Amino acid sequence: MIKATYSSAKDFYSLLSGLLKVTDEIILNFTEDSIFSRYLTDDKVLMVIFKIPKEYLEDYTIDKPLGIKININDLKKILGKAKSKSATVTLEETEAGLKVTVRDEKTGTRSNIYIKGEKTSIDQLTEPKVNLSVTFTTDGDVLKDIARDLSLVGEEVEISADENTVTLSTEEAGRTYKSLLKQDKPLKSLNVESPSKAVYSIEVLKDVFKVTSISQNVTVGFGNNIPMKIEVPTDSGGQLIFWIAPRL
């Protein structure tokens, strides 16, 4: 059987809420290097990835790689029991499915739940392999504000970056929007290998940016007409990844 312990129930629950269009069912993949879920929307525009590197997994006992399909709702029900931020989640494999356990050393309490799961072949992380010419890090609250901005105007979002400035532009029926992200305002870091520019669906971008608000260190990368990568880390190590295909 497979065992796994994560140092935070709150963060684990925050990552799951980030899954856009979950379908109420996910396939948790247990591998030697990480536990992860890999979802791709029907339009194939957005890829959602939930990932927890082994580096952040305690007492991780992995015999053979396994993928278990479960109801994400049942998984959320048990995570909700966590009252403190010092809570801990433990995933144990069973014949019927999963055994999720939430214990907190503080009040020395525990909570069990036997989720009916259908195990199957393991999925692989087939992420776009490309050189991200431009990367920057910002608090998710900023991206959420810009999401609100884009809500007022725009059909497509053109994001570009010169030597040290990132710009987001949209147009719609005469109206216009254009924000400027520089370092220390608000960007915590900005790395430009070369002037790059690309266009993404304002609808998808909006939905994603709203979710990144769960992190203070969101990393965004992109390049000339290549998919955009959005990393949403947590203090406990858990991480959401979003890949957004460009409009060409």
């Binding site: 900023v142 029926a173 992200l181 305002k185 608000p186």
Partner: protein
Amino acid sequence: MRVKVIDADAFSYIFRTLEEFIDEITLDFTSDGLKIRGIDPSRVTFIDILIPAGYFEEYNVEKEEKVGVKLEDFTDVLKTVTKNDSLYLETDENQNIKVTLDGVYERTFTFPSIVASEIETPNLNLEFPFKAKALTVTFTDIIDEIEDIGGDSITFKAEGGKLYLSANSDMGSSTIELSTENGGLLESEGGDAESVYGLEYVVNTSKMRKPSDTVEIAFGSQIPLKLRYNLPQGGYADFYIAPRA
């Protein structure tokens, strides 16, 4: 032109108020300051606004310039303002209006220029029998309280330098008194008068709570009610409301 406001948060509420009365406004930038003037579809309320150049941190207006803008799109942008955001108002070459908010990050919204109506000026130098002054926050709270009484009409009554606002109810009525004695009024002048005005029109100005510090109340029997919401640097937002039948 190029204009800048430091307290954008308060500045926005002026337009959120206007949005209660009109849909399209005409920003009239003059050498003396921003003039905004409008009238609601029912011709019940007339609005006259003066925001002196001194109110703005930066006021660069060479020649008079009028800019028509759909108020809903304008306020939607202004609603995204924090307590630390600064605001810029500028017109490009195409005569479009550019709103630039700057705080945590810099962002610019652009609106296409539209046709701006001309608003005929009713008698402004009109003479009012009764005149009074009061704290905006005080007056506003009193109005928001009258609204909850459940009426469509509000009676303004001045007697012995004291103002009585009353609105009917299912049972009877409720009257709130304002005067220099109870602290409701800062000062009072003129004789006596009594009129009834639409409650919705009076309430719709309450949004001036933040931008305005003091308000001046003036009216008479069967003559328009004038609420002047004083703004810093000599500014003002005047609301004229016609009496009832």
